[PDB]
Structures are given as structure tokens and as C-alpha cells.
Design an enzyme around this catalytic site. Structure first.
Site, PDB file in Angstrom:
ATOM      1  N   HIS B 168       0.817  -1.191   0.000  1.00 55.53           N
ATOM      2  CA  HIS B 168       0.000   0.000   0.000  1.00 55.53           C
ATOM      3  C   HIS B 168       0.859   1.252   0.000  1.00 55.53           C
ATOM      4  CE1 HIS B 168      -3.289   2.720   0.861  1.00 55.53           C
ATOM      5  NE2 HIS B 168      -2.585   3.181   1.871  1.00 55.53           N
TER       6      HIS B 168
HETATM    7  C1  HEM Z   1       3.334   5.959   5.066  1.00 54.98           C
HETATM    8  C2  HEM Z   1       2.315   5.082   5.081  1.00 54.98           C
HETATM    9  C3  HEM Z   1       1.088   5.285   4.151  1.00 54.98           C
HETATM   10  C4  HEM Z   1       0.976   5.996   3.020  1.00 54.98           C
HETATM   11  C5  HEM Z   1       2.025   6.848   2.283  1.00 54.98           C
HETATM   12  C6  HEM Z   1      -0.393   5.866   2.553  1.00 54.98           C
HETATM   13  C7  HEM Z   1      -0.890   6.487   1.427  1.00 54.98           C
HETATM   14  C8  HEM Z   1      -2.231   6.511   1.119  1.00 54.98           C
HETATM   15  C9  HEM Z   1      -2.821   7.365   0.089  1.00 54.98           C
HETATM   16  C10 HEM Z   1      -1.963   8.320  -0.755  1.00 54.98           C
HETATM   17  C11 HEM Z   1      -4.138   7.127   0.093  1.00 54.98           C
HETATM   18  C12 HEM Z   1      -5.222   7.744  -0.828  1.00 54.98           C
HETATM   19  C13 HEM Z   1      -4.986   7.249  -2.289  1.00 54.98           C
HETATM   20  C14 HEM Z   1      -6.002   7.758  -3.307  1.00 54.98           C
HETATM   21  O1  HEM Z   1      -6.370   8.960  -3.051  1.00 54.98           O
HETATM   22  O2  HEM Z   1      -6.323   6.900  -4.208  1.00 54.98           O
HETATM   23  C15 HEM Z   1      -4.419   6.113   1.087  1.00 54.98           C
HETATM   24  C16 HEM Z   1      -5.654   5.600   1.385  1.00 54.98           C
HETATM   25  C17 HEM Z   1      -5.908   4.698   2.393  1.00 54.98           C
HETATM   26  N1  HEM Z   1      -5.031   4.323   3.386  1.00 54.98           N
HETATM   27 FE1  HEM Z   1      -3.085   4.740   3.390  1.00 54.98          FE
HETATM   28  N2  HEM Z   1      -1.097   5.055   3.418  1.00 54.98           N
HETATM   29  C18 HEM Z   1      -0.208   4.698   4.414  1.00 54.98           C
HETATM   30  C19 HEM Z   1      -0.517   3.900   5.486  1.00 54.98           C
HETATM   31  C20 HEM Z   1      -1.745   3.357   5.806  1.00 54.98           C
HETATM   32  C21 HEM Z   1      -2.028   2.437   6.907  1.00 54.98           C
HETATM   33  C22 HEM Z   1      -0.944   1.964   7.922  1.00 54.98           C
HETATM   34  C23 HEM Z   1      -3.334   2.129   6.841  1.00 54.98           C
HETATM   35  C24 HEM Z   1      -4.168   1.212   7.760  1.00 54.98           C
HETATM   36  C25 HEM Z   1      -3.572   0.051   8.125  1.00 54.98           C
HETATM   37  C26 HEM Z   1      -3.892   2.816   5.687  1.00 54.98           C
HETATM   38  C27 HEM Z   1      -5.213   2.759   5.292  1.00 54.98           C
HETATM   39  C28 HEM Z   1      -5.706   3.406   4.173  1.00 54.98           C
HETATM   40  C29 HEM Z   1      -7.056   3.221   3.641  1.00 54.98           C
HETATM   41  C30 HEM Z   1      -8.137   2.282   4.221  1.00 54.98           C
HETATM   42  C31 HEM Z   1      -7.179   4.006   2.565  1.00 54.98           C
HETATM   43  C32 HEM Z   1      -8.366   4.230   1.570  1.00 54.98           C
HETATM   44  C33 HEM Z   1      -8.343   3.352   0.298  1.00 54.98           C
HETATM   45  C34 HEM Z   1      -9.676   2.802  -0.213  1.00 54.98           C
HETATM   46  O3  HEM Z   1     -10.700   3.383   0.284  1.00 54.98           O
HETATM   47  O4  HEM Z   1      -9.649   1.840  -1.063  1.00 54.98           O
HETATM   48  N3  HEM Z   1      -2.900   3.562   5.054  1.00 54.98           N
HETATM   49  N4  HEM Z   1      -3.232   5.757   1.718  1.00 54.98           N
HETATM   50  C1  LIG Z   2      -2.574  -8.018  -7.252  1.00 55.59           C
HETATM   51  C2  LIG Z   2      -1.739  -6.750  -6.892  1.00 55.59           C
HETATM   52  C3  LIG Z   2      -2.547  -5.881  -5.912  1.00 55.59           C
HETATM   53  C4  LIG Z   2      -2.123  -4.412  -6.037  1.00 55.59           C
HETATM   54  C5  LIG Z   2      -2.801  -3.600  -4.936  1.00 55.59           C
HETATM   55  C6  LIG Z   2      -3.334  -2.239  -5.426  1.00 55.59           C
HETATM   56  C7  LIG Z   2      -3.439  -1.418  -4.135  1.00 55.59           C
HETATM   57  C8  LIG Z   2      -3.199   0.120  -4.845  1.00 55.59           C
HETATM   58  C9  LIG Z   2      -3.013   0.703  -6.144  1.00 55.59           C
HETATM   59  C10 LIG Z   2      -2.857   2.121  -6.287  1.00 55.59           C
HETATM   60  O1  LIG Z   2      -2.638   2.720  -7.674  1.00 55.59           O
HETATM   61  C11 LIG Z   2      -2.894   2.907  -5.081  1.00 55.59           C
HETATM   62  C12 LIG Z   2      -2.729   4.333  -5.162  1.00 55.59           C
HETATM   63  C13 LIG Z   2      -2.781   5.124  -3.963  1.00 55.59           C
HETATM   64  C14 LIG Z   2      -2.999   4.506  -2.687  1.00 55.59           C
HETATM   65  C15 LIG Z   2      -3.158   3.090  -2.604  1.00 55.59           C
HETATM   66  C16 LIG Z   2      -3.095   2.286  -3.790  1.00 55.59           C
HETATM   67  N1  LIG Z   2      -3.252   0.894  -3.659  1.00 55.59           N
HETATM   68  O2  LIG Z   2      -3.612   0.342  -2.510  1.00 55.59           O
END
Ligand code: HEM
Ligand SMILES: CCCCCCCc1cc(O)c2ccccc2[n+]1[O-]
Ligand SMILES: CCCCCCCCCCCCCCCCCC(=O)OC[C@H](COP(=O)([O-])OCC(O)COP(=O)([O-])OC[C@@H](COC(=O)CCCCCCCCCCCCCCCCC)OC(=O)CCCCCCCCCCCCCCCCC)OC(=O)CCCCCCCCCCCCCCCCC
Ligand SMILES: CCCCCCCCCCCCCCCCCC(=O)OC[C@H](COP(=O)([O-])OCC(O)COP(=O)([O-])OC[C@@H](COC(=O)CCCCCCCCCCCCCCCCC)OC(=O)CCCCCCCCCCCCCCCCC)OC(=O)CCCCCCCCCCCCCCCCC
Ligand code: HEM
Ligand code: SF4
Ligand code: SF4
Ligand code: SF4
Ligand code: SF4
Ligand code: SF4
Ligand code: SF4
Ligand code: SF4
Ligand code: SF4
Lengths: 289, 216, 289
Positions: B168
Site C-alpha cells: 500500500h
Molecule cells: C506511510 C504510510 C502510508 C501511506 C504513504 C499511505 C498512502 C495513502 C494514500 C496516498 C491514500 C489515498 C490514495 C487515493 O487517493 O487513491 C491512502 C488511502 C488509504 N489508506 Fe493509506 N497510506 C499509508 C498507510 C496506511 C495504513 C498503515 C493504513 C491502515 C492500516 C492505511 C489505510 C488506508 C485506507 C483504508 C485508505 C483508503 C483506500 C480505499 O478506500 O480503497 N494507510 N493511503
Molecule cells: C494483485 C496486486 C494488488 C495491487 C494492490 C493495489 C493497491 C493500490 C493501487 C494504487 O494505484 C494505489 C494508489 C494510492 C494509494 C493506494 C493504492 N493501492 O492500494
């Protein structure tokens, strides 16, 4: 460390992670120095250094019997002499000085190095030198001005209550050696009884203010005195009247810490939530739309 | 289409997210110190090993509370649908930076939704097994055998969630411009067009249309 | 730590950096509890607490002689009583309970804190409290449900096999005190011989299933029993039949670790080589040419 599993207090250790202390069902011990029976022979200074394998320097005579002139890293107990006519006739008050093994030690409370100072279930307060960093905070935290730094190793030393003899069932070296039996040793409970009997005999001889010195300000001590003039402890070469841990030290080691902690956590939250809430302050936020 | 950026994430969901991240660093690192005792330095994640044993579970509970706030605010956008299949079939192509050419991407893609459920399921597993193995408060009420299975499962779930978060964070660093959206809240329209076409199409229509609805 | 240089196993220590164990040429010792000679006097509970400087709370009577009702941080051994008619007549089976000093200890295997649990060359398994973090994993890893946490210091305690007496040539306190000589102590080799002689006399009296309890599942124990009904150990207040380290614990502490390690290394390689191989995913890789 903690092999004896009876450590009731340990320097610089958070209150929610206490030291190992399951074997705490042990009687408290105590030394009782009856200054009315002391003949100022200095046997205790000699026996202490012989037993503990330490030797101070050959000093100088500056006009008094006292020598060495102070406690040091190489002198864990010293006889302090006072000549006075404050009570109406010439009196030579002689008192053995050294660690009081306080129930609530200020040295331990001021020390910033984990495990450098510990308190055993029987009352002995001892320095664990592997952890000492030479800061000297204990010198200021002690109400009795006891701890002394060793210039050759940057660590503090003092009377250990002969923890190496007491731990295996023998009384301390100075207690055994005392020629007149001015120094007594046993459980604290029976030393308090001997103390009260001696006070009663001193009152019967005319010392209406005889008393036991076992200061409540530090929670009582494991080194106690029987004094002919308990109303005037300062006559005995400055023994403190009503000693306690200094207020400044209490606040520094106490409330200041959590307060600082809250500030820091709060500040970090604020700044982080602030950057995220408002966003950077760049040259132009305006031609972004 | 006359603004450098569009809002992707509200402040409330941004504040929560970075709270979770900080809590997660401490909890994952303390967890890893018990899992791999050879990494001695991590036994100082909460100051001392004795302190880390105490605080791990409390910070763990805080993560779960905050992830439940996230759950109710994002779940509806993470629902798998028939339009996600295309993604799932050209994974190799997506990883080469060509996902637009192969799939239909709404608010969050199919990878992001898989992660979302993975993350949400693991935190539930971690919460249940965590409570069961928590001394001194709760482990005493459970049969020894359940405590033992919980020790095995909590270790495994925590490792799976750490892996997941490593991937992630990588993806968030890789699909450039994403971290800024999570810190500041705004994404440039082109980012929207390339990484999330259908999504931006909807904002653009919702936008224009309701402003056209006003009666300029 | 390691001053005795005979540490054969140490909790949470990688197998390629073994603890100091050059002085390992020492006979294994063992306690032998012959429950057929036990009179349920509880002397061993009393001698253990007296020697170890621990005291449990004054509890309650809830209908049985057993008391305290369980092992605790302040009760390292407890007598467990069982009344039964399973073998055809009324029998009162009484068994001393406490650490079995397993050859392959599950406590040690489950413990995540380096040096918190060690095994000496003579068979004693002991807790090194300075390293204990209070997690309680050893309680679940133990097949016998032995370790107990002390709420006053967040550390686990149990029977040490009187390591402080045995280390200097004396038998444990409960062994010496036992009124009827139900408890015996010596080298493991001679306790196994005494065990087999006692079994032979019990068979001669009609107990065809008498036997020695020295479970092979944990590699044999340094605390062994002689039981009148060795085919039915659960009659003795739940002593386990064929104990072993639980399968879930074995897998959690065993294969899961290296597997996780490979995943993590592999994952890090993959992601790093992936970023470098393909390069970032920016808004336009196309107007770069
Ligand atoms: C440095 C560590 C992390 C970074 C840089 C990061 C980065 C991001 C970013 C950039 C987004 C929004 C992406 C978008 O706008 O498409 C996002 C969404 C999210 N993050 Fe993180 N993340 C980090 C750690 C975590 C952790 C530790 C958790 C919980 C274990 C978490 C849970 C989530 C969830 C649930 C979302 C929403 C995605 C969705 O609704 O499908 N993140 N993260
Ligand atoms: C089978 C490979 C699965 C790949 C997992 C994709 C998860 C994926 C892909 C993205 O372009 C994202 C851009 C911003 C923040 C989170 C993101 N995550 O979680
Ligand atoms: C919103 C406002 C929130 C307010 C919360 C109040 C918290 C105060 C906690 C406390 O003091 O209770 C103390 C309580 C009582 O202890 P005590 O024995 O009476 O006295 C404390 C000791 O005397 C001596 O004090 P102490 O050593 O026990 O201090 C305790 C605490 C101390 O730590 C803290 O108080 C906060 C940490 C401050 C960091 C400041 C760093 C600054 C340096 C930067 C300089 C920059 C350089 C320029 C170039 O250490 C631990 O508890 C672990 C906390 C770990 C935080 C990890 C963060 C890493 C982030 C990275 C990502 O201890 C606790 O219960 C566990 C505290 C749990 C809080 C989390
Ligand atoms: C391509 C796939 C490559 C596969 C290679 C397989 C490796 C597995 C090695 C192993 O487990 O053999 C174990 C072997 C057997 O040990 P054992 O006593 O049967 O059991 C292990 C203990 O029970 C308990 O386990 P353990 O504590 O002994 O674990 C061992 C290992 C454990 O460490 C590892 O397994 C890998 C490290 C994992 C890091 C994960 C960090 C995740 C946290 C991030 C969270 C982010 C926060 C979000 C905000 O620690 C050490 O061996 C030193 C490795 C140092 C790596 C330093 C990297 C720093 C990079 C910075 C630049 O020990 C080894 O021979 C020396 C291993 C040497 C490998 C290098
Ligand atoms: C949901 C709430 C959680 C609870 C109640 C919880 C509770 C616990 C407890 C009580 C322990 C045993 C050690 C100790 O007492 O400190 C533990 C260990 C551990 N936790 Fe958690 N935890 C939680 C969340 C997490 C999370 C989010 C992760 C992943 C980052 C995690 C990973 C681990 C690991 C890897 C271990 C050690 C496994 C081992 O020793 O092999 N836990 N947890
Ligand atoms: S040994 Fe005894 S009598 Fe002699 S100076 Fe010391 S306390 Fe006094
Ligand atoms: S000098 Fe040593 S013992 Fe005294 S306060 Fe400093 S570290 Fe503690
Ligand atoms: S007299 Fe001073 S050095 Fe001795 S225990 Fe008390 S505070 Fe500590
Ligand atoms: S109790 Fe021991 S260490 Fe203290 S003054 Fe007497 S001889 Fe010295
Ligand atoms: S001391 Fe001996 S006879 Fe008495 S209850 Fe304990 S094992 Fe039995
Ligand atoms: S409670 Fe102590 S001894 Fe038991 S497993 Fe945890 S750190 Fe090890
Ligand atoms: S009976 Fe339990 S506590 Fe004792 S050595 Fe065996 S596994 Fe460890
Ligand atoms: S071997 Fe020692 S520690 Fe163990 S039950 Fe007997 S007296 Fe207690």
C-alpha cells in the site's frame, strides 16, 4: 541485575513497569547509632575501609580531630565532632555520619539512569555502578549530602549498609567493631525498641529532650540515631532538623515530566494537524486556480 | 476543467488516515520486535521492552477504532462490481504503468478495493485475537487452547497486514501525486483522468451539471 | 548473565548464536515425587514459601482441603487432592503440583524476550526476571499450566527447583522437609532407578498399572512422579496424559518465522526491483519524448 527478586524501588524506572520484587516478605533491618555512648574512636571508619577494600588519602590536620574531613568515594563513613556550651556546660558531641538508607531516598528519586540506584526489601539502598553515568544528580537529591563521586571512574559511592555481609546473615563491619556498643544492629522493629529504652534512661539522667532520630520526612531511615538533644540535631555537626526531599527536586522529578510530555504530544498533534488542515505556504496558492 | 486541482479527500478523512499511520508504525514495530527477537533495537519502539508489551494492545485498539471510522466513510466506494474484472485480468499490464489502456477505473481501483477489504478484515482478526491474548485483562477468561490458537493467528494476521501496508505505501509512492492528495486533499484533473477516469468524469458531470442546473 | 557458563537453552535467541555453555559436563538432577507415599501434609508448600521469602494471601475454604486453590506468583507449589471410586473402592489421590523442569520446555520455546527463560546443564529451567516483559506467552506454551504473573511487577514466577540451594550442593527445601520421604532428590539417573524399584513394589501390592511419569513428549522431566495408576494420570487432579508442546505453538514459534522472513525479504526485493525496472507512474511519461 534483579537476581534477588526483592527490588522495591529502582531509579529512573517508569511506575507502570516496576522492578522484580516477588520475594519481598523479609524483615526491615536497621543500624542504631547511640551518640550518648560514642567515644569518638574512629574504629568504624577503619573497619569500614578494611572490609570494603578502600583507602582514602593521608590528609592534613587543620585544627580539629575530624579526619578525613568529609565523606568521599574512599571514605564511606566519618566521625564528626562538635564542641559546644549551648546547653550550659562544655559538651563534646560526636556523631558517626554516612548514608541514612532512607525509606524514600532522594538520591534514587533524582537519578536519571535506569537501575543506577536500587532499594532492597530489607531497607538497604545501594548503587549499581554498571549503570552510573556520573551526573551527580543524587548528590543534590540527597537531603543528607551523602553521595560522593570517584574521580578515577566517574561513579558515586557511599555506605552500602554492608549489603555483602547482611545479604548472607552477618551484621555490618562497623556495627561489630564498635568498642562501646554505641552502634547496634538488628531488625528495625527491635532497634526502635532499643532506641526507646535508651531514650528513657537518658531522660532519667536529666536529658529531657533525648530522642530517636528517624525522620518522617524521608519516611524513616534504616540508619537511626539516639540523641541526647533531639530538639537540636544541628548541634551534632549539622544533622538536619526535619529533613525532607527538596521541593524543587520533587517538582523537577515529578509533575514537570508529564506536563512536558503533554506539551510535546499536544504540540506534535497541533503542528501535524495544522499542516494537513491548511496546507503549505508556497509563493502562489492563487495561480493554482 | 479550469482548476489545477480537484478535492479527492476531505480533511476529516485525511486527519484520521495520518493518525492511523503513526499509530500503525508503533504497533507494527513493537509487534515485529516480539516476532523477531533478534531485531533487538525494535524492543525500544515504546522506550523499553516492558513498556512496549503494555502499550502495543492499547495503540492496537486505537487503530481499530479509527479504521472503523474509515470503514463507514469509504466502504461504499470500495464495493466490487463487474467493471472490476478487466483490472483483475490485466494486472501485469497495470503494473507496467498502463492501467488506463486496460481497465475502467472509478474512485478507487480494483487493487485498492482488494487492499481495503484485506486491511479491514485483518484488523478485525487482530482485534479479536488481540483481546484473547491480552494479559492481564482478558486472556484469563479464555480456555488455554483458544489462547494458543489466537497467539498463532494474531502473529500470522499481523504479518499479513504489515506486508499489505508495505505494498500500500509502495503503490502510494509509485502512482505519483497520490501522497499530496492524502496530505493536502487535492488531485490535479489529469491525475484524475489518467488513474481514475470514470471517477473524474462523474465529478466533472456532477460539477458542471449542477452549476448548469442553477441557471447561470 | 551467563556467569555460570552452562546455559544450554535460552529464550528468544537465534539458533546460530547459542548461549555460553562450555561448562556443561555436569550430571542432570531430578526430584521424584512418589504420590503413593504422600500424606497430603502440605509441608512442601510451607517449606517452599519459607525458603523463597514469599507469602500468598489468606484465602478461603470452598469445600475442599486444597489451598491455596492454584499455583500463583506467591505459591510455587500446591497440593492437589482427588477423591475417586473409579478403581473400585474409595481412594484419596494426592499430588504435589508445580514446574516439571521439562527437558524441552514449552515456556522457553514460546517466550519472545531474549534471556527471560533459561535452561541450565543440570536440567533446571529458570526465569531471569530482569528480561521478563509480562506478555504471558509462557503460560500458553507450558503443557502443564505452570507460569504465574505477579500483578505487582508484571513478571512470571514458578518453582526454580531451589536453584539457589542446588547450585551450591544442597537439595531443595521441599525435598528435605517431606515427612514421609514421598519426595526424593538426586541425580536423574539414580532417581529413575529409585522410581523403577518403587514401581516394582507397587506392582507386588496389586497395582498392575503403577508407573513412572517422565513424559517423552517434552523430552522427559526433571520433576518426575511415581503413580499408582500411571494409565490414568488425569485421576491425579488433571495431570496430562502424554503431554507435549501444542501443535499451534510449535508452528507459530517455528516455521511461521522464517516463512514470514522470506516473504518480507522477497517483497522488499520485488518492490525495489519493480520501481527501478519500470520507473515511476507520473501524470505524463509521454510528453517526456
Ligand atoms: C506511510 C504510510 C502510508 C501511506 C504513504 C499511505 C498512502 C495513502 C494514500 C496516498 C491514500 C489515498 C490514495 C487515493 O487517493 O487513491 C491512502 C488511502 C488509504 N489508506 Fe493509506 N497510506 C499509508 C498507510 C496506511 C495504513 C498503515 C493504513 C491502515 C492500516 C492505511 C489505510 C488506508 C485506507 C483504508 C485508505 C483508503 C483506500 C480505499 O478506500 O480503497 N494507510 N493511503
Ligand atoms: C494483485 C496486486 C494488488 C495491487 C494492490 C493495489 C493497491 C493500490 C493501487 C494504487 O494505484 C494505489 C494508489 C494510492 C494509494 C493506494 C493504492 N493501492 O492500494
Ligand atoms: C493531546 C495531549 C496528549 C497528552 C498525553 C499525556 C502523556 C504523558 C504520559 C506520562 O508522563 O504518564 C506518565 C506515566 C507515569 O510515569 P511516572 O513513573 O509517574 O514518571 C515518569 C518518569 O518519571 C520519567 O518520565 P518517563 O520516562 O516514564 O516518560 C514517558 C514516555 C515519555 O515520552 C513522552 O512523554 C512523549 C515523547 C516526547 C518526544 C520529544 C522528542 C523531542 C526531540 C526533538 C529535538 C529536535 C532536534 C532539532 C534538530 O515514554 C513512554 O511512555 C513511551 C511513549 C512513546 C512515544 C513514541 C513516539 C515516536 C514517533 C515516531 C513516529 O507513564 C505512562 O503511563 C505510560 C505513558 C503512555 C503515553 C503514550
Ligand atoms: C528472495 C527471498 C530471500 C529469502 C531468505 C530467507 C531468510 C530467513 C532467515 C531465517 O529465518 O533463518 C533463520 C535462521 C534460523 O533461526 P531460528 O533460531 O531457527 O529461528 C529464528 C528465531 O526463532 C526468531 O526469528 P529471528 O529473530 O532469529 O529472525 C532473523 C532475522 C530476522 O529478520 C528477517 O527475517 C527479515 C527482516 C524483516 C523486516 C520487516 C520490517 C517490517 C516493518 C515495517 C512496517 C512499516 C510501518 C508502516 C508505517 O534477523 C537476523 O538474522 C539479521 C537480518 C538483518 C536484516 C537487516 C535489513 C535492514 C535494511 C535497511 C537498509 O537464522 C539465521 O540464520 C541468520 C539469518 C540470516 C538472513 C539474512
Ligand atoms: C486490533 C488490536 C490489537 C490488539 C488487542 C493487540 C494485542 C496484542 C497483544 C496483547 C500481543 C502480545 C504482546 C503484548 O501483550 O504486548 C500482541 C502481539 C503482536 N501483535 Fe498485536 N494487537 C493489536 C493490533 C495489532 C496490529 C495492527 C498488528 C500489526 C501491525 C499487530 C501485530 C502483532 C504482532 C506481530 C505481535 C507478536 C507476534 C509474536 O509474538 O509472534 N497487532 N498483540
Ligand atoms: S566505632 Fe563506635 S564508639 Fe567508636 S567512633 Fe564509631 S560509633 Fe563511636
Ligand atoms: S551520579 Fe550515578 S547514581 Fe548519581 S544520579 Fe547520576 S547516574 Fe544516578
Ligand atoms: S541518605 Fe542520601 S544517599 Fe543515603 S539513602 Fe538517603 S538520599 Fe540516598
Ligand atoms: S554499614 Fe558497612 S558500608 Fe556502612 S559505614 Fe558501616 S562498615 Fe561502612
Ligand atoms: S511434603 Fe511430602 S508428604 Fe507432605 S504433602 Fe508434600 S509431597 Fe506429600
Ligand atoms: S511473561 Fe516473561 S518469561 Fe513469560 S514469555 Fe513473557 S517475557 Fe517470557
Ligand atoms: S512445566 Fe512449564 S513452566 Fe515448567 S519447564 Fe516445563 S514448560 Fe516450563
Ligand atoms: S524445588 Fe524449591 S522452589 Fe520448587 S517447590 Fe520445592 S521448595 Fe519450592
Amino acid at each position: 541485575a534483579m537476581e534477588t527478586q526483592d527490588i522495591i524501588k529502582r531509579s529512573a524506572t517508569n511506575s507502570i513497569t516496576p522492578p522484580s520484587q516477588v520475594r519481598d516478605y523479609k524483615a526491615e533491618v536497621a543500624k542504631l547509632i547511640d551518640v550518648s555512648t560514642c567515644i569518638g574512636c574512629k574504629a568504624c571508619q577503619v573497619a569500614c575501609s578494611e572490609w570494603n577494600d578502600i583507602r582514602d588519602e593521608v590528609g592534613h590536620c587543620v585544627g580539629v580531630y575530624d579526619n578525613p574531613a568529609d565523606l568521599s568515594a574512599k571514605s564511606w563513613t566519618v566521625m564528626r565532632f562538635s564542641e559546644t556550651e549551648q546547653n550550659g556546660k562544655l559538651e563534646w558531641l560526636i556523631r558517626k555520619d554516612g548514608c541514612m538508607h532512607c525509606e524514600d531516598p532522594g538520591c534514587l528519586k533524582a537519578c536519571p539512569s535506569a537501575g543506577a540506584i536500587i532499594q532492597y526489601a530489607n531497607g538497604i539502598v545501594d548503587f549499581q555502578s554498571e549503570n552510573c553515568i556520573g551526573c551527580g544528580y543524587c548528590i543534590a537529591g540527597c537531603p543528607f549530602n551523602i553521595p560522593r563521586l570517584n574521580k578515577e571512574d566517574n561513579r558515586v559511592y557511599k555506605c552500602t549498609l554492608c549489603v555483602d555481609r547482611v545479604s548472607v546473615g552477618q551484621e555490618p563491619a562497623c556495627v561489630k567493631t564498635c568498642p562501646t556498643g554505641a552502634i547496634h544492629f538488628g531488625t528495625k522493629k527491635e532497634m526502635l525498641e532499643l532506641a526507646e529504652q535508651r531514650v528513657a534512661k537518658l531522660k532519667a539522667r536529666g536529658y529531657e529532650h533525648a530522642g530517636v532520630y528517624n525522620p518522617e520526612g524521608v519516611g524513616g531511615t534504616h540508619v537511626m540515631y539516639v540523641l541526647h538533644h533531639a530538639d537540636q540535631p544541628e548541634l551534632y555537626h549539622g544533622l538536619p532538623k526535619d529533613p525532607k526531599i527538596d521541593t524543587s527536586v520533587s517538582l523537577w522529578k515529578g509533575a514537570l515530566k508529564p506536563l512536558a510530555a503533554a506539551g510535546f504530544i499536544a504540540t506534535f498533534a497541533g503542528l501535524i494537524f495544522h499542516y494537513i488542515g491548511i496546507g503549505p505556504n508556497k509563493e502562489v496558492d492563487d495561480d493554482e486556480e | 476543467s479550469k482548476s489545477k486541482m480537484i478535492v479527492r479527500t476531505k480533511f476529516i478523512d485525511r486527519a484520521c488516515h495520518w493518525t492511523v499511520v503513526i499509530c500503525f508504525f508503533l504497533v507494527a514495530l513493537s509487534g515485529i520486535s516480539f516476532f523477531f527477537p533478534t531485531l533487538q533495537w525494535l524492543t525500544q519502539t515504546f522506550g523499553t521492552p516492558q513498556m512496549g508489551r503494555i502499550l502495543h494492545p492499547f495503540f492496537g485498539i486505537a487503530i481499530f477504532v479509527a479504521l472503523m471510522f474509515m470503514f463507514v466513510r469509504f466502504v461504499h466506494h470500495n464495493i466490487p462490481d463487474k467493471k472490476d474484472i478487466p483490472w483483475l485480468l490485466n494486472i501485469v499490464e497495470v503494473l507496467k504503468g498502463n492501467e488506463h489502456k486496460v481497465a475502467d477505473v472509478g474512485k478507487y481501483n480494483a487493487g485498492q478495493k482488494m487492499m481495503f477489504w484485506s486491511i479491514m478484515s485483518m484488523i478485525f482478526v487482530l482485534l479479536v485475537t488481540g483481546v484473547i491474548i491480552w494479559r492481564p485483562y482478558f486472556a484469563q477468561y479464555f480456555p488455554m487452547q483458544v489462547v494458543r490458537y489466537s497467539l498463532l493467528i494474531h502473529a500470522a494476521a499481523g504479518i499479513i497486514l504489515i506486508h499489505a501496508i508495505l505494498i500500500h505505501m509502495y503503490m502510494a509512492f509509485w502512482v505519483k501525486g497520490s501522497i499530496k492528495g492524502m496530505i493536502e486533499g487535492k488531485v490535479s484533473r489529469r491525475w484524475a483522468k489518467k488513474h481514475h477516469p470514470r471517477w473524474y468524469r462523474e465529478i466533472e458531470k456532477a460539477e458542471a451539471k449542477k452549476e448548469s442546473e442553477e441557471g447561470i
